[PDB]
Amino acid sequence: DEDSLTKQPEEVFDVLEKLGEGSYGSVYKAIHKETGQIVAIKQVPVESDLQEIIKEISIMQQCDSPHVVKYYGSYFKNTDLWIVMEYCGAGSVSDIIRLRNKTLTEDEIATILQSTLKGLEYLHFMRKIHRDIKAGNILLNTEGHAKLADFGVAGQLTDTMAKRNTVIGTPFWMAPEVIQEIGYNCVADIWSLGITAIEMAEGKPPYADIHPMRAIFMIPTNPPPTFRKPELWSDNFTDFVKQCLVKSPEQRATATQLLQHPFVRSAKGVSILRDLINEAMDVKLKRQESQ
Amino acid sequence: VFDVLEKLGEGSYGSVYKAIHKETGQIVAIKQVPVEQEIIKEISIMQQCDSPHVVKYYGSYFKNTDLWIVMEYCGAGSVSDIIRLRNKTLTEDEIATILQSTLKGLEYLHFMRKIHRDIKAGNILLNTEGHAKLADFGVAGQLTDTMAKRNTVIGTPFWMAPEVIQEIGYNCVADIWSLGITAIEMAEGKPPYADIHPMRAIFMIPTNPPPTFRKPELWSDNFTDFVKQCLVKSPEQRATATQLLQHPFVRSAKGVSILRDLINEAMDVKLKRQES
Ligand SMILES: Clc1cccc(-c2c[nH]c3ncnc(N4CCOCC4)c23)c1
Ligand SMILES: Clc1cccc(-c2c[nH]c3ncnc(N4CCOCC4)c23)c1
Ligand SMILES: O=S(=O)(O)C[C@H](O)CNC1CCCCC1
């Protein structure tokens, strides 16, 4: 009766393994004991910038897209904030490359970036900049559907604010105009997508072995990066990356425009991700049999 | 050429492996970095240095496209690793002894017109005997007759001095600010602003008052004052390595013998984890 209303979070959820780091704390697999539903929970201590966390939650709540991780709700556990989210059972593309010790095929990249671009097209229409687009922040569910994750550093455009000027992101992936003092908008995410395309192909971004703070100073001045071995890759993939990595943000393609690029327009269904998913989660299950 | 063993970790800019010199049986560390000129800077600065408080340079080989740099091996690893492995922060007395050796390294570097620019627990090593040595000259800077200051914005954000972050030029005492943050890091387990985004922190350090301990009542007046003297915002006013070697917290520091248990526990937990 009245004993069901004050059940504490560690009584509602069965908390399992750490999945990785998020914006302002760690993320864990969990089961809703009642419904059997599986979820991800980011645990955030009270000494975090709680303004920014409410922003993240807010941006997630406003978004309703099969290409963006859903928000389910929040719980307090002592002073700790539990943020409860959609669980994607294959993990990040970063994890899947690491687990298999293999980069992705042109075909796998094409399909994943098409879903990623549909996410970006939704966000950009809703005047949201992600600002942290990389393989780390693109998730696959067991069915092979990609979802944008980690709105920790995301930015909002409004009637009175057509541009942001906050220098933020992960250096290697950050657009020149983000790094320079001038204001920027949604197409910053397209530059980051370009770097991510290279990251999935080659296993790391350009300048990956250089110091991050030396890279940030070079990106604005340097010509647009390209593949480490251009002759390995199709003309369509090479051109896709070239269209993403245009230095002038005014000239740079939109998510909508890039969805029509031959490399992406021609993309196969999620069925070509079946092997990639199965191998990854197999290597995961084997490594978990060291308990 | 030499017998390559386990990864020991990442540097700022390259992976580092244990190795044995096939000829002499001598044990060494090798940092592997691929090539896209600036790397020569690190090697150059390493060769110019000859100090028991700095990892010595042994030589270089290129293997495929990757340059392998051969360095002094310190068998206890980084202070960062030792705090993590034992899941314990360090006592005032352990910090005192380690930072005294660290300061003698800085005093040598600063006299040689070198700025390290990446001072943190990650980049302070102990050999098996418990002697501390400065590692990772990846982002290190050189002063000359016509260049009394650098202006390159570089380092690890949480640890970086305000004057380094601002466009104004800076000199050796940038390392002393970083040492202050490192003192807090070893005491508390993390730098200040640790639960903030790095790129938000970098913009706050110049404007914010000097960071302090999360729990002031836990720490001696000597340690509190040491950190306060390191974290002076004005680089002109900030103490030098030489001056801080005379600070009561450090001058009164015990021999390396108080590191014996810390070392033994750490390397034991390392050897156990390597059997799984
Ligand atoms: Cl705030 C944040 C940031 C990145 C990813 C997630 C996440 C949500 N649902 C997930 N399912 C599986 N794995 C996830 N990650 C957690 C972060 O490390 C990568 C895996 C997630 C959450
Ligand atoms: Cl470039 C660089 C940066 C930091 C440390 C080393 C290093 C040299 N000799 C070593 N012996 C033992 N452990 C070492 N670790 C410390 C932990 O991180 C990896 C390198 C080292 C090298
Ligand atoms: O899905 S669970 O979190 O386990 C169940 C929720 O805690 C239910 N909380 C409601 C609060 C308002 C009054 C009715 C109950």
Swiss-Prot record, chain B:
<feature type="domain" description="Protein kinase">
    <location>
        <begin position="2"/>
        <end position="250"/>
    </location>
</feature>
<protein>
    <recommendedName>
        <fullName>Serine/threonine-protein kinase 4 37kDa subunit</fullName>
    </recommendedName>
</protein>
<feature type="active site" description="Proton acceptor">
    <location>
        <position position="118"/>
    </location>
</feature>
<feature type="binding site">
    <location>
        <begin position="8"/>
        <end position="16"/>
    </location>
    <ligand>
        <name>ATP</name>
    </ligand>
</feature>
<feature type="coiled-coil region">
    <location>
        <begin position="259"/>
        <end position="276"/>
    </location>
</feature>
<feature type="binding site">
    <location>
        <position position="31"/>
    </location>
    <ligand>
        <name>ATP</name>
    </ligand>
</feature>
<feature type="modified residue" description="Phosphoserine">
    <location>
        <position position="234"/>
    </location>
</feature>
<feature type="modified residue" description="Phosphothreonine; by autocatalysis">
    <location>
        <position position="152"/>
    </location>
</feature>
